[PDB]
Amino acid sequence: GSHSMRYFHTSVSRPGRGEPRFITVGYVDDTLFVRFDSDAASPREEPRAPWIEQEGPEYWDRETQICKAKAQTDREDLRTLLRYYNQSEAGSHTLQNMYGCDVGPDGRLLRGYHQDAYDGKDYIALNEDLSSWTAADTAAQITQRKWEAARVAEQLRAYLEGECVEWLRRYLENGKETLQRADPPKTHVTHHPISDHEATLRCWALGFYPAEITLTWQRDGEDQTQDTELVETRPAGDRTFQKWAAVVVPSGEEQRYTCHVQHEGLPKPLTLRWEP
């Protein structure tokens, strides 16, 4: 189907404790494929998926230099933001940046992105037009004026419509074993006595990829949204994800309850019940 590529970056200042810490990671869909951490002894961008390992030394050298450069420009930008917000040099602050692209099943650009946040709040974002900006406040408007003057959007647009999509397509091909495979959830229902009067029914979805999933409980066909404990989808640590949904059921009433699972890896939504 559709796919995405994202590069995420975080710099965190630490006054009196040297230069900011810089960490960046790249993803295709829900798959991590590259990482860089400035605090590694002689830091390099490193592979984190098998299908990127085949890129040659020139690729890793360029990537590494780009990461080092962004760490350095982030240091300058953190200093600028202290000025823009009239802040002291004593505190730790955070600068986050994301950029990348979404493509459709045919490989065509669906959306490009480039956006920044300061201290966990929106700062400036490239709009969906890839031609104009949304500034969150009067500080970000200063950046906007500079970036309008320098025709920054046009340069980002050229990357997002060109290289971003072209390299994503390359990765999807080289990684076709995994990036183009959905792993359906393995599902089951468990029963957890609370007392002689009631028990929890917990519906599990394990080992699925990608992360998007819907899990719901029904009682005689009616959705139990308000009475369901639904945990956040969580990584298993091996590429796949987990989720569960639980409801408290009076003794003897279990056969009224069905769990429903939707995942792109499932041809049709599944219906499960507790089987003693």
Binding site: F8, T10, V12, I23, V25, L32, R35, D37, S92, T94, Q96, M98, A117, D119, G120, K121, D122, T190, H192, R202, L206, V231, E232, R234, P235, A236, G237, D238, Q242, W244
Partner: protein
């Protein structure tokens, strides 16, 4: 500055079977700022050489990390995750429950 307290889940990679090697995970998410300290505990003591993912974030800019270690669950051994963050006056301890 607005701060967001971490969500915490402690769980295993595979369904727990006593005597069978597995991975113990502590997933912390939805937090800001990014500095956070996480320990995994076996019978109240810190497990050594725990690994973690590289810092990343969600669409809303909040951070997430996975801490993990190999472990072999038993009937009697108790595992937990201890999390400290600026939003917490006291570190939060979440016990591992093999049924969650």
């Amino acid at each position: 500055m607005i701060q967001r307290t971490p969500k915490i889940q402690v769980y295993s990679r595979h369904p727990a079977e006593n005597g069978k090697s597995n991975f113990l995970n502590c997933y912390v998410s939805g937090f800001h700022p990014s500095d956070i300290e996480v320990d995994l505990l076996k019978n109240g003591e810190r497990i050594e050489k725990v690994e973690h993912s590289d810092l990343s974030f969600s669409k809303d800019w909040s951070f997430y990390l996975l801490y993990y270690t190999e472990f072999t669950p038993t009937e009697k051994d108790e595992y937990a995750c201890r999390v400290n963050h600026v939003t917490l006056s006291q570190p939060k301890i979440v016990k591992w429950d093999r049924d969650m």
